[PDB]
Amino acid sequence: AVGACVLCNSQTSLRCGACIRRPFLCCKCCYDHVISTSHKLVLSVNPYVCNAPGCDVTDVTQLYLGGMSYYCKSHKPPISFPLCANGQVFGLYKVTDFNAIATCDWTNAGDYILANTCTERLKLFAAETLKATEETFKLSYGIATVREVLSDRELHLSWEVGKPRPPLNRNYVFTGYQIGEYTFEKDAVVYRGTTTYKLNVGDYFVLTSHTVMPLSAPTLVPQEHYVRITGLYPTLNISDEFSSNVANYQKVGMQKYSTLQGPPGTGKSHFAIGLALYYPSARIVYTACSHAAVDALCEKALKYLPIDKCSRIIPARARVECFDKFKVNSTLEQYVFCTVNALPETTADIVVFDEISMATNYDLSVVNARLRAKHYVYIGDPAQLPAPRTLLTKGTLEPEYFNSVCRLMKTIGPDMFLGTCRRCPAEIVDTVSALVYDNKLKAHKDKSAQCFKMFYKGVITHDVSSAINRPQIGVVREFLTRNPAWRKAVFISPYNSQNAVASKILGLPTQTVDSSQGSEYDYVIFTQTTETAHSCNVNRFNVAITRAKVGILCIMSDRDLYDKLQFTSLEI
Ligand SMILES: [Zn+2]
Ligand SMILES: [Zn+2]
Ligand SMILES: [Zn+2]
C-alpha cells in the first residue's frame, strides 16, 4: 500500500483502482490522471469512497476529507477539504502518455507506438497492462468440447454458444482437461497433443490464461561505455573461422549492452557461438523467446563448444520436443541455453538474447530481472517478423515499435551490422537489400538462375478468415511436373489454411512465413495467396524469400512486390 509513483518515483499511499495494474501514483500525478480520464477510484490503506453508510460515491473528484475519513458533497461535515484540489489528491508524503496507456484497449497500432516512445517506467507499466489485457481477453473465447474422435490425429469439435471461437492455428495453444497442451488445424479438424493421449469424448479444452507478474527491471539497463574490455578475457589464438568478428567481439566487451542487426544468413549464430571462443572462460547464457531459436543456438554450440559445459534448460511443464544433446537443467554449466520464460535467477559474464525482433518489452524486462550480467548482446533483425500482437486489429506496427532494441536499431542504428548474406542466391539478396536493408546487404552467392516469379491472382476462398488460393496451388502442381528437382521444396505461404490445402494436393512439407523464420531450405515455393496487409508486409515478404539457399518460386498476388522481385518471370 506504501509504494513508488510509476511516473516520478515519489513515495505515496495512492494507487489508481481503475488501472488494471493498480499503479502507485504520487499526489500531483494521481490528480492529473483522475481529472483527465474516466479513472476516478483512488486506493490507499482504505479506498477513497464516501464513509457515510449506504452511499455509493467512489469518484475522488466528488470526495472530501472530514476528520481522518472521506465523504461526498451530500455527507461531508462543515470542516471538510476536497480530496482533489491544488493539482493534487490528498495522500501521505504530499502524464498525457500515462493516461493514453492506462485507458487504451491495445487494438490500435498507436497504443504500441506510445508503449515504445514513452519513458522507461511507462514502458514497463505499458507492458504489464498490455499482457494483463491480452490474458483477460483469453477468457472471452468459448470452450471446445470434443463431440467424437476419428483417428490418432483427427477429431470433430462442439463449441460454446454465445462466446466467439478462437482462430484455429498453431498460434492458439489450449490446455486440455490437466491432460497437457494441444493445437488444432483444418467438418474434419486435426488434434496435436503435447502429451500423447487417447482423446476422450466430452473432455474440454480452454485457453492457457497465465498470470501476468509485475515487472521491476528496465527493458534495457542504462548504457555504459568502457575504455577497455571489462570483466572478460580475450584469446590471442582466435580460430580464423571467427576472425571476421574480432572487432565486434571487442565492442561487446567495451559496452554494457550491444545491438547486432544480422539480415538472413549473415552469421548471427556464428557470431553468438563465436563470442564464447573469443572470451573462452566467460559464462554465457543464450536466450530467445522460442524453443526453436534456443535449439538453433544449441545446434551451432554443439559444433564449436565443449558439450560438457553446455546445458539446455527445459521447464518441467514441457510443451514441444527440443534440444536433447546437452545435459538438461544444469543451471551452473558455463553455457546455458534457455527460453526467456524459463530463465533461472542467475548471473553471467555475457547474456546473448537472439531473435530480438520476436521479443516484447515484457520479455526484455524479464531477461534484465532474472540475469545480472557484465554484458548483454541483442541479436536479430528489425526487417524480420515481430511477436504476434493478438489484440492489435487496427494499424500496422512498424519495426521501430517492436521493442526498445528494435527502436534503437531503427533510430540510432545497430552497434554492429552483418553486411553479407551467404545463404541466398543473389536474385533474393538484391531484392531484399533494396526492399528493407537500404541496399547495404551484399550477396556472397552468384545468381542461381533458379529464382522464379509468376503474377497469378487466382481465386481467394477463406477457412473462416485464413485465406486459401486453389488456383495458385494448381499453378505450383503444374510447375512441379516440369521441374522435378523442386520435388524436395518446402511450400510456404502467409496462411495455415493455404498450407493445409497445399499439403494434401502437393505432398510438399509446409511452413507459414512466421514459422519459417530462422530456417533455410534448398528450394522454396511461396504462394502469396491474397493481397492483404498481412501477405504484403515487407518484413514477412523479406523472411519468406530469404529462406531459400538455391531456388525459389513465388506465385504473387501483389503487383508491387511482384515487380520488385529480381527473378525470371514464368508464363501460364
Ligand atoms: Zn487509472
Ligand atoms: Zn508522480
Ligand atoms: Zn456520501
UniProtKB/Swiss-Prot annotation:
Q: Where does Zn(2+) 13 bind?
A: C50, C55, C72, H75
* Subcellular localization, as worded in the UniProt entry: Host endoplasmic reticulum-Golgi intermediate compartment
Where do the LRR repeat units fall?
208-228
- Residues the entry annotates as binding Zn(2+) 11: C5, C8, C26, C29
Q: Which residues bind Zn(2+) 12?
A: C16, C19, H33, H39
Catalysed reaction, written as an equation: ATP + H2O = ADP + phosphate + H(+)
Effect of mutating S36P: In strain: Omicron/BQ.1.1, Omicron/XBB.1.5, Omicron/EG.5.1
Domain (+)RNA virus helicase C-terminal spans what residues?
419-572
* Domain ((+)RNA virus helicase ATP-binding): residue spans on this chain: 237-418
Annotated positions binding a ribonucleoside 5'-triphosphate: G262, P263, P264, G265, T266, G267, K268, S269
What changing M409I does, per the record, is: In strain: Kappa/B.1.617.1
Report the protein's function: Plays a role in viral RNA synthesis. Multi-functional protein with a zinc-binding domain in N-terminus displaying RNA and DNA duplex-unwinding activities with 5' to 3' polarity. Activity of helicase is dependent on magnesium. Binds to host TBK1 and inhibits TBK1 phosphorylation; the interaction with TBK1 decreases IRF3 phosphorylation, which leads to reduced IFN-beta production.
Assembly and binders? Interacts with nsp8 to form the replication-transcription complex (RTC): nsp12, nsp7, two subunits of nsp8, and up to two subunits of nsp13. Interacts with host TBK1; this interaction inhibits TBK1 phosphorylation and decreases by 75% IRF3 phosphorylation, which leads to reduced IFN-beta production.
The protein's name is Helicase nsp13
This protein's species is Severe acute respiratory syndrome coronavirus 2 (2019-nCoV)
Phylogenetic classification of the source organism: Viruses, Riboviria, Orthornavirae, Pisuviricota, Pisoniviricetes
Q: Which residues of the full protein are shown?
A: 5325 to 5916 of 7096
